[PDB]
Design a protein around this ligand. Sequence first.
Ligand SMILES: CC1=C(/C=C/C(C)=C/C=C/C(C)=C/CO)C(C)(C)CCC1
Length: 134
Amino acid sequence: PVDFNGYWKMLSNENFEEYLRALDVNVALRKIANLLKPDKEIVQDGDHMIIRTLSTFRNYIMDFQVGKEFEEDLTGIDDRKCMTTVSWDGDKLQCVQKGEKEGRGWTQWIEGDELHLEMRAEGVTCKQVFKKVH
Ligand SMILES: CC1=C(/C=C/C(C)=C/C=C/C(C)=C/CO)C(C)(C)CCC1
């Protein structure tokens, strides 16, 4: 019961500000990012899955190779570089980053027509709820 191939827009954020603080994002970026709420458009195609991000500010596409490893340069976010992998624990999805800090390792869980998840970073939890647009 997982089908990413669709359209998902962000509704709100309860810790997008606090999460920006973990990576020590500028005061300007935090300001701009507040009004911003990128819309993700996933395109599943086998073992290759691309997660779009179109905020009309700066395009940051990634190539999530399910089960396989790939680097991930976070330059544009908070200027970072690491190695990320993704697994399928079960009904949920779980991505682990072999970087620094203590938290960097995403987790997900879909619950219908709203792509919910639990972002983690440096011990901080960021709940960002995305809704299907269909
Ligand atoms: C702060 C900030 C941004 C947030 C970027 C992030 C954090 C994207 C998330 C990537 C992940 C974690 C993907 C795993 O599926 C963007 C550039 C987009 C817009 C303005 C500045």
